[PDB]
Curated annotation (Swiss-Prot), chain B:
Full-protein residues shown: 53 to 302 of 303
Tissue expression as described in the entry: Expressed in leaf trichomes and stem trichomes.
Subcellular location field: Plastid, Chloroplast
Cofactor(s) required for function per UniProt: Mg(2+)
EC number assigned by the record: 2.5.1.28
UniProt name for this protein: Dimethylallylcistransferase CPT1, chloroplastic
Domain of life: Eukaryota
Molecular-function annotations in GO: dimethylallylcistransferase activity; magnesium ion binding; prenyltransferase activity
Annotated family: Belongs to the UPP synthetase family.
Gene Ontology annotations for the cellular component aspect, listed alphabetically: chloroplast; chloroplast stroma
Organism: Solanum lycopersicum (Tomato)
Positions annotated as active site in the UniProt record: D24
Enzyme class at the top of the EC tree: transferase
Gene name of this polypeptide: CPT1
GO biological process: plastid membrane organization; polyprenol biosynthetic process; response to cold
Length: 244, 244
């Protein structure tokens, strides 16, 4: 198979970020620091995420993709996974009407069939109720990883080729983008709370020219002032996309 | 159909075994010092050799260095022609000594797009060093993350088309075996030049890599800067999605 790359590919990126990506990290250490019970940080996840949607919506931000549960988090104890998947279902039922009144559209990416059936039904109902809403699109990545996303797009392309729907030479960036679960437009800014300088198998393909913002602030402490700082910082960067 | 909660292992991550290196900021280093526009680029592969020598003594086994991306074709024909001729020159003048403790050199990227003379220089550099026993230097030249994932997808589609694999055999390990940069993946990414972004480097391979961004322009990056980056790496806690 031949290659040629000096022919051309448009990058689906942008004053203001259109799409923000969010790694919601540091919730355990936030509870350890305040001497609270082990899962009390995670109880702030969905409420804070609603606060961030509110602020971002007013600034003209159109998309937020938030990392809620990765495919490697299955490595944690049965007790933690069960507690936090139950907590996610509960919080999604508690803050739903707050998200719905702001005209937020809610989508979930990840492998849903591995989740508990009650959470699968709750997710399907949330997506149905909000699919027509016209405000900010909140995408929640739940049992998601970049490896998984690329693998399921590759399988989808293989099956199409098997059924006579495409040739090997039709496989390009545009086709791949439309087979991934996180699509164009790609994140302009990634904010990771919790102090770690790494991506932890989040949106690997989608982050090719994303601007990174790592903060030391633990996620339950990330408020309107911190989001405003991150956007102003983003506005101070020069994006060249390989050109001059 | 998908399932991800059973297979929670695989992957390939004191001292980082594999360092990834984005050699950025060469234009600004020549501008700041008032030199000719391409004077910084003449330092790229000499300094890269110096980094390999230091890295070899500390026990590092692999360096993957970004020398020319698939989006850099967007720059002026003058700059691109000058820089590809300069790479051909630098690649002949260094990486020549008969010492067996020197680096083994591979090139990843689409070589057929490059000037014929540079193609011949690359072939000669890979042949003369294939027996060397030191550090494996991989030079990423006309390379990008999209390109790497796309060519692996095309190779998998081809095999499936020709009866050589099943769609249900497609997993992380088979995909990894089709990429140009394979397991083991970089433990540490060092980007010189002030920008906090990845610019379509090793997208799949950087899933759990530790990021180290420095403002030092690449021609000023020496032994003290490398020792600082390794020290910073050693103070980091890698969890790979797990706990306790
Ligand atoms: C939904 C499940 C099972 C887990 C939560 C995943 C999550 C929110 C991770 C980021 S916060 P976490 O890694 O728990 O907290 P730190 O150890 O980083 O302080
Ligand atoms: C080939 C190298 C060293 C990496 C790309 O850096 P660029 O200078 O092309 O990256 P951007 O700032 O354009 O993102
Ligand atoms: C090898 C390549 C293409 C990048 C080197 O630095 P640049 O050419 O990007 O210079 P700056 O604009 O970053 O200073
Ligand atoms: C927010 C989510 C779902 C993942 C956060 O990163 P992790 O806490 O899993 O990442 P590592 O620090 O283990 O890389
Ligand atoms: Mg964490
Ligand atoms: Mg640059």
């Amino acid at each position: 198979i031949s290659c040629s790359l000096n022919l051309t590919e448009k990058l689906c990126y942008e004053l203001m970020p259109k799409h923000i990506a969010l790694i919601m990290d540091g919730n355990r250490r936030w509870a350890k620091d305040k001497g609270l019970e082990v899962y009390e940080g995670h109880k702030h996840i969905i409420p804070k995420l609603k606060e961030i949607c509110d602020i971002s919506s007013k600034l003209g931000i159109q998309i937020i993709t938030a990392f809620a549960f990765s495919t490697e988090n299955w490595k944690r104890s049965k007790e933690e996974v069960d507690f936090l998947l139950s907590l996610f279902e509960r919080s999604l039922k508690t803050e739903f009407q707050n998200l719905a009144k702001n005209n937020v559209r809610i989508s979930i990416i990840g492998c849903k069939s591995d989740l508990p059936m009650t959470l699968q039904k709750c997710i399907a109902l949330t997506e149905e109720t909000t699919k027509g809403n016209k405000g900010l699109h909140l995408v929640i990545a739940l049992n998601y990883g970049g490896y998984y996303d690329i693998l399921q797009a590759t399988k989808s392309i293989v099956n199409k080729a098997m059924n006579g729907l495409l040739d090997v030479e039709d496989i390009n960036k545009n086709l791949f983008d439309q087979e991934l679960e996180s699509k164009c437009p790609n994140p302009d800014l990634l904010i990771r709370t919790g102090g770690e300088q790494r991506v932890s198998n989040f949106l690997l393909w989608q982050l090719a020219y994303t601007e990174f913002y790592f903060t030391n602030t633990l996620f339950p402490d990330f408020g309107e002032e911190d989001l405003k700082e991150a956007i102003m910082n983003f506005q101070q960067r020069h994006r060249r996309f390989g050109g001059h």
